Structure 1
Amino acid sequence: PSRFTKTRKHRGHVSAGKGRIGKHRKHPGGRGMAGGQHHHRINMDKYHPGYFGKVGMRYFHKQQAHFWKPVLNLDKLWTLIPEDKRDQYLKSASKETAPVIDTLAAGYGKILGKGRIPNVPVIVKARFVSKLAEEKIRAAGGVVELIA
């Protein structure tokens, strides 16, 4: 709100905090990103390196949905089982009754390997997996089933 601003305190002081000598003017150095290569070069090279110039290939008509692939790590893999039913699988860890985790229905494209799941076998259905993530799942006694 207006009453807490420094404008209120500057009332009675001539320059309004803008200085007598410098004397607040309209656009003393230019508008927007003017002079980014001329009189704003130092700032721009110090705080935005890489700003000017070109980079690799162009992609005409890029649709992000082609690239949709949310990653999920193993350390969060067991969160896709609801908490009420989680502890039953964590105990009695055995095959012939192993939790099927459909990571795609959970909204994930690829399972990565940040690692250290419990030693309980689980059936991980995924579109993609990292090599180490499938190692840790198999080491735990589970399996990854490729789905589409």
Structure 2
Amino acid sequence: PSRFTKTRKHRGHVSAGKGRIGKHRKHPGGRGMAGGQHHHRINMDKYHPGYFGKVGMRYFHKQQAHFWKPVLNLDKLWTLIPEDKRDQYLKSASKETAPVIDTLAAGYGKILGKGRIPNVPVIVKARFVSKLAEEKIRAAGGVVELIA
């Protein structure tokens, strides 16, 4: 709200809060990003290195989520199993009745290997796995089932 605003406290002092020498004027230095390569160069490398010039390959008609492979770390994994149904398998570790986890169903597309999972077998099915994700699932008596 305006009543809360400095321009109310400035009422009665000349020049608002903008000096007597330097004025408040229409665009000194120019509108927008003028002369990033000239009179504004310092600010534009420092605060913004990289800005100017090209790098890398063009790609015509790139369609986002051709590249849709959301990631899931072992770090969690056991979250994709309903809170309650979870301790069931957790206390009864077995290659007999190991919980099948469909990660594609959960919206992911690649299991990444960050973290530690407890030593309890799991059927993990996903498109794509990190080499270590597999190595840690296998470590605790599980497997990876590649799906699509």
Q: TM-score range by the shorter chain?
A: over 0.9
Q: Is residue 17 of structure 1 aligned with residue 17 of structure 2?
A: yes
> How big is each residue's C-alpha offset from its partner over 1:53-89, in whole Å with a ceiling of 9 and x where there is no partner?
1000000000012001100000111000010110101
Distance in structure 2 (CA, Å) of the matches to 1:72 and 1:15:
58
SS in 1 for 2:9: helix
Distance in structure 2 (CA, Å) of the matches to 1:124 and 1:13:
71
Residue segments in structure 1 that go unaligned for 5+ positions in a row: none
Structure 1 residue 140 displacement after superposition: 0.7
Residue 130 (structure 1) aligns with: 130
Residue segments in structure 2 that go unaligned for 5+ positions in a row: none
SS in 2 for 1:135: helix
Structure 1 residue 122 displacement after superposition: 0.1
Structure 1 residue 126 displacement after superposition: 0.4
SS in 2 for 1:125: strand
Distance in structure 1 (CA, Å) of the matches to 2:134 and 2:33:
49
Runs of 4+ in 1 over 2 A off after TM superposition: none
Residue 53 (structure 1) aligns with: 53
Distance in structure 1 (CA, Å) of the matches to 2:137 and 2:69:
20
Q: RMSD of aligned C-alpha atoms?
A: 0.5
TM value normalised by structure 2: 0.99
TM value normalised by structure 1: 0.99
Distance in structure 1 (CA, Å) of the matches to 2:85 and 2:58:
48
User: How many residues matched?
Assistant: 148
Distance in structure 2 (CA, Å) of the matches to 1:115 and 1:4:
50
Structure 1 residue 125 displacement after superposition: 0.2
Distance in structure 1 (CA, Å) of the matches to 2:60 and 2:73:
32
Distance in structure 2 (CA, Å) of the matches to 1:4 and 1:10:
12
Structure 1 residue 124 displacement after superposition: 0.3
Distance in structure 2 (CA, Å) of the matches to 1:119 and 1:62:
42
The percent of aligned pairs where both chains have the same amino acid is: 100
Residue 116 (structure 2) aligns with: 116
Distance in structure 1 (CA, Å) of the matches to 2:132 and 2:115:
8
Distance in structure 1 (CA, Å) of the matches to 2:36 and 2:106:
46
Structure 1 residue 115 displacement after superposition: 2.3
> How big is each residue's C-alpha offset from its partner over 1:36-62, in whole Å with a ceiling of 9 and x where there is no partner?
000000000111100001000000000
Structure 1 residue 96 displacement after superposition: 1.1
Greater helix fraction, Structure 1 or Structure 2 = 1
Distance in structure 2 (CA, Å) of the matches to 1:140 and 1:127:
20
